CSV table of N, CA, C and O in Angstrom, one decimal:
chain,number,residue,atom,x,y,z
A,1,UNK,N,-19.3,14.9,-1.7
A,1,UNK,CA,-18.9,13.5,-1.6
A,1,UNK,C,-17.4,13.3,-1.4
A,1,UNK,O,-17.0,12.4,-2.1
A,2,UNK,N,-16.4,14.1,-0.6
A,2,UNK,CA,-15.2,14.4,0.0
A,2,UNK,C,-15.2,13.2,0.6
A,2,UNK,O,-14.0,12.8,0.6
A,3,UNK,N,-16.1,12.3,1.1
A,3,UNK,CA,-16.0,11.7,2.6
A,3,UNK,C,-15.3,10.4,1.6
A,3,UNK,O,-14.4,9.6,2.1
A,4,UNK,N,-15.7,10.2,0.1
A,4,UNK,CA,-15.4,8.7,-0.5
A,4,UNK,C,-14.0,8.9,-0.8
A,4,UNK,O,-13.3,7.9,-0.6
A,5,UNK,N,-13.5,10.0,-1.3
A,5,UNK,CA,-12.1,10.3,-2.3
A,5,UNK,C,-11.3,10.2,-0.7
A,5,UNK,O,-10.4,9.3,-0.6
A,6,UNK,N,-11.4,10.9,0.2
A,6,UNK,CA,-10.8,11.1,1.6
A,6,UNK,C,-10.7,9.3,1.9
A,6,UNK,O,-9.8,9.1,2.7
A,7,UNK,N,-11.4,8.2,1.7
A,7,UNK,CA,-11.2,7.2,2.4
A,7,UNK,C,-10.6,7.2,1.5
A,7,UNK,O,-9.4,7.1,1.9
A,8,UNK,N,-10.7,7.1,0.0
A,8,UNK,CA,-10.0,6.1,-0.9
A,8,UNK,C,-8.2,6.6,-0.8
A,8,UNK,O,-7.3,5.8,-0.7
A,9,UNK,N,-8.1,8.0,-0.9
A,9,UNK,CA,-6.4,8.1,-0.7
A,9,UNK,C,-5.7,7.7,1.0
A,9,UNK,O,-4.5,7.6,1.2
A,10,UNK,N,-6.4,7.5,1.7
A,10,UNK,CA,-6.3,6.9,3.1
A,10,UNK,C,-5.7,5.7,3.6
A,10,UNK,O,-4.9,5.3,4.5
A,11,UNK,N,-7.3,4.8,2.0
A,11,UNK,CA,-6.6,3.5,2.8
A,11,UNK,C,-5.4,2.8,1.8
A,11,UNK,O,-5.1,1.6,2.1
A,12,UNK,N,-4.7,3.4,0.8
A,12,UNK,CA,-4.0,3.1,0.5
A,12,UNK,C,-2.5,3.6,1.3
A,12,UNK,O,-1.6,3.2,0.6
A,13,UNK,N,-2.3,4.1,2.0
A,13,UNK,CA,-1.9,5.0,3.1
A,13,UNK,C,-1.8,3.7,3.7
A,13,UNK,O,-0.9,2.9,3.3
A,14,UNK,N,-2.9,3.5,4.8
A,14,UNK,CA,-2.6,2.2,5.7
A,14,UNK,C,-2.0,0.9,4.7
A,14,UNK,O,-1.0,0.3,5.1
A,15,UNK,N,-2.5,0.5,3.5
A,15,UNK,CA,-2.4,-0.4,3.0
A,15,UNK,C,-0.6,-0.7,2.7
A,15,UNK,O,0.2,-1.7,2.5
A,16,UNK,N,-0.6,0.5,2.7
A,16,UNK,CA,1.1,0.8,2.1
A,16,UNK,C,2.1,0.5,3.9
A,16,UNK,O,3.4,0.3,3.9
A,17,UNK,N,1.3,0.6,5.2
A,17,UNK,CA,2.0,0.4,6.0
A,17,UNK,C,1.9,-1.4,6.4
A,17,UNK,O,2.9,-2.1,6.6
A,18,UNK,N,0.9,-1.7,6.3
A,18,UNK,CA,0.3,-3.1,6.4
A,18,UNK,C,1.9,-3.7,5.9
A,18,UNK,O,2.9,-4.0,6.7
A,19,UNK,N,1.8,-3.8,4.4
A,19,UNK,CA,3.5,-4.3,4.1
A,19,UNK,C,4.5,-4.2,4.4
A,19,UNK,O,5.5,-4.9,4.0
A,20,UNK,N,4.5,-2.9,5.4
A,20,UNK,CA,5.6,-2.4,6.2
A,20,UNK,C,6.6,-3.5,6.6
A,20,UNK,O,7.8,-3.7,6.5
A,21,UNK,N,5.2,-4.1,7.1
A,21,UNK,CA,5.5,-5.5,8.2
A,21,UNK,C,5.5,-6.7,7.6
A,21,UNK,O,6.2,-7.5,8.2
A,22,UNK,N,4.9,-7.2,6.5
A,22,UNK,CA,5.2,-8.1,5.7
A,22,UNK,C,6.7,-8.0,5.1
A,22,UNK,O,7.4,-9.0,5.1
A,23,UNK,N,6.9,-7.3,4.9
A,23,UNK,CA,8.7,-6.8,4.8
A,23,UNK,C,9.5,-7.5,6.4
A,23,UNK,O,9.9,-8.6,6.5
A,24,UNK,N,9.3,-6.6,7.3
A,24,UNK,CA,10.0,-7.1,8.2
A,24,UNK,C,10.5,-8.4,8.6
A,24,UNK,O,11.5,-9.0,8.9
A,25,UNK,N,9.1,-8.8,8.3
A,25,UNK,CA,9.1,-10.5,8.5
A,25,UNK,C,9.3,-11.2,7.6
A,25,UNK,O,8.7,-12.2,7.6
A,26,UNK,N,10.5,-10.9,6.5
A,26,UNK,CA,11.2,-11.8,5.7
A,26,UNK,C,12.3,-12.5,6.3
A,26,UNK,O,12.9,-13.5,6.0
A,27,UNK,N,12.4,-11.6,7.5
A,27,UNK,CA,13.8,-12.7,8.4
A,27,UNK,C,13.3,-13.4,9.9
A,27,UNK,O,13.8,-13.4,11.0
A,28,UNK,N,11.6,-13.9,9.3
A,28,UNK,CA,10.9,-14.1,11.0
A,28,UNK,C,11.8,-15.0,11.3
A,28,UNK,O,11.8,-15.5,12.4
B,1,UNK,N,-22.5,2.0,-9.0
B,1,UNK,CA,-21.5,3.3,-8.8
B,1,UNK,C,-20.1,1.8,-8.6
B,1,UNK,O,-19.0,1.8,-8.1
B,2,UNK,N,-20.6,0.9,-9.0
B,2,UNK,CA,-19.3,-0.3,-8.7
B,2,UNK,C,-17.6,0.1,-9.0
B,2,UNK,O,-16.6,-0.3,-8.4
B,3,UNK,N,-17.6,1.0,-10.2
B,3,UNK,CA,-16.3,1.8,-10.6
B,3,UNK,C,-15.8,2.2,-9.6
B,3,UNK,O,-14.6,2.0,-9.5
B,4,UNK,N,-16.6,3.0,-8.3
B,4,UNK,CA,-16.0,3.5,-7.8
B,4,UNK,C,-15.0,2.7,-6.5
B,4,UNK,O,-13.9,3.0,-6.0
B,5,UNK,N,-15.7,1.9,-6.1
B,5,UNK,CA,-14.8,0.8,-5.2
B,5,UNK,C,-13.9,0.1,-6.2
B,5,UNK,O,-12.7,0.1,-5.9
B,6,UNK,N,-14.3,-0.4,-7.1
B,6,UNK,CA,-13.2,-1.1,-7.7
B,6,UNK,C,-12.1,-0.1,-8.0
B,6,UNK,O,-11.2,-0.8,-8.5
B,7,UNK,N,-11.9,0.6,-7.9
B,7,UNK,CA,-10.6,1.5,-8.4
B,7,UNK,C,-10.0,1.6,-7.0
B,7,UNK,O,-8.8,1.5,-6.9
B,8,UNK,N,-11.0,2.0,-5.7
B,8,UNK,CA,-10.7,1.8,-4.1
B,8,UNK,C,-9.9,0.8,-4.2
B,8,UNK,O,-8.7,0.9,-4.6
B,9,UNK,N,-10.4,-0.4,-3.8
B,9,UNK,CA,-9.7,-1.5,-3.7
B,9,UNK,C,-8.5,-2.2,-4.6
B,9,UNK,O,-7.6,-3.0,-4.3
B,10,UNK,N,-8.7,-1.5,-5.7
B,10,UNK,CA,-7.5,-1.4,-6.6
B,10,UNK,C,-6.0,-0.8,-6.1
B,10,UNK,O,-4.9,-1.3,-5.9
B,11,UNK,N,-6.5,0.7,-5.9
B,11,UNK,CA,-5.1,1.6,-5.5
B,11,UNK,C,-4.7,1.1,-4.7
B,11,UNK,O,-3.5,0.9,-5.1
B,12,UNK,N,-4.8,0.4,-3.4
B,12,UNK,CA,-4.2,0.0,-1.9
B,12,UNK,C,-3.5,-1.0,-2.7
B,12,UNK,O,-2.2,-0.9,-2.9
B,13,UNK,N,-4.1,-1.7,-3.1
B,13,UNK,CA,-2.8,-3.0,-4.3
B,13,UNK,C,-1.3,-2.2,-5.0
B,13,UNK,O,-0.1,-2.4,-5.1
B,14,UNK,N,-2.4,-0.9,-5.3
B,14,UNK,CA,-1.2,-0.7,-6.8
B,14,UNK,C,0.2,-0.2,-5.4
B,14,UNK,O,1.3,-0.6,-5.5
B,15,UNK,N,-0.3,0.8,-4.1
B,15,UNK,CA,0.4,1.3,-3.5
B,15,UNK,C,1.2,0.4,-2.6
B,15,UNK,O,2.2,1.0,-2.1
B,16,UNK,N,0.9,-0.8,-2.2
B,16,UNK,CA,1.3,-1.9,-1.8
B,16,UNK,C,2.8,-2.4,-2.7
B,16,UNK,O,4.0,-2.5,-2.5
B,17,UNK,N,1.9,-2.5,-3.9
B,17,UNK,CA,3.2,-2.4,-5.0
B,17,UNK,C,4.7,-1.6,-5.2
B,17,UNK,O,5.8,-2.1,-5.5
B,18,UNK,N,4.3,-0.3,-4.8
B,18,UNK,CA,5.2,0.9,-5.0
B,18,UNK,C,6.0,0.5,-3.9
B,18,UNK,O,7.2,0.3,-4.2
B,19,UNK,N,5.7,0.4,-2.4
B,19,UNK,CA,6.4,0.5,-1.6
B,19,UNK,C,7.4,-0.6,-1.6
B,19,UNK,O,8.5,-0.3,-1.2
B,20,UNK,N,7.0,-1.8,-1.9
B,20,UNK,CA,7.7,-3.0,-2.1
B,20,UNK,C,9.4,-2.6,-2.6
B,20,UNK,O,10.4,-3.2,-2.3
B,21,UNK,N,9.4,-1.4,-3.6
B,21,UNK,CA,10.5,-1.5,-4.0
B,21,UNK,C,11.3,0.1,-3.4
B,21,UNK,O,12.5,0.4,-3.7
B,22,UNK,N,10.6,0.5,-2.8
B,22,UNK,CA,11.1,1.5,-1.1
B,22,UNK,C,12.2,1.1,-0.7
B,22,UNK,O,13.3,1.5,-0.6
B,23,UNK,N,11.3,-0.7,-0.3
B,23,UNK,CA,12.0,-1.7,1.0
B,23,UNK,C,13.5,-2.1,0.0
B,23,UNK,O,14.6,-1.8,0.5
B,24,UNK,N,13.5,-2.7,-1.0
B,24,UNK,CA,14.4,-3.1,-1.8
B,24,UNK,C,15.3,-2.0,-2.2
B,24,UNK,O,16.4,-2.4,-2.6
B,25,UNK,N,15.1,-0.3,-2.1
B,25,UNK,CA,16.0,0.2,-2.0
B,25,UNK,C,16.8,0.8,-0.5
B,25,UNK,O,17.5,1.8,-0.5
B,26,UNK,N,16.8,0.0,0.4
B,26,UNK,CA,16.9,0.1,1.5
B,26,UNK,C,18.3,-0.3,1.2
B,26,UNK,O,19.1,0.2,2.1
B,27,UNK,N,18.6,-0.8,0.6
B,27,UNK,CA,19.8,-1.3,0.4
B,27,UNK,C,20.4,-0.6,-0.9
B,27,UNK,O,21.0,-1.3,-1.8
B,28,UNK,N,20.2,0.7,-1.1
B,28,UNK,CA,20.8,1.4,-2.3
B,28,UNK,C,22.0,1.3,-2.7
B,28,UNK,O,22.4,2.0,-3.7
């Protein structure tokens, strides 16, 4: 069951980029 | 097995969190 622990450190990964851009766009 | 998404959908939050203050040290 690799396939659940592999999504779960993943999508915190993307999740952590997502805000990347919420950051950016403090000076839209 | 509900524990196990809830902790999913939890971390992307908590790591969302972390990076927030990444951005704020950008300006060290």
């Amino acid at each position: 069951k690799g396939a659940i622990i592999g999504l779960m450190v993943g999508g915190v990964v993307i999740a952590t980029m997502i805000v990347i851009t919420l950051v950016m766009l403090k000076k839209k």
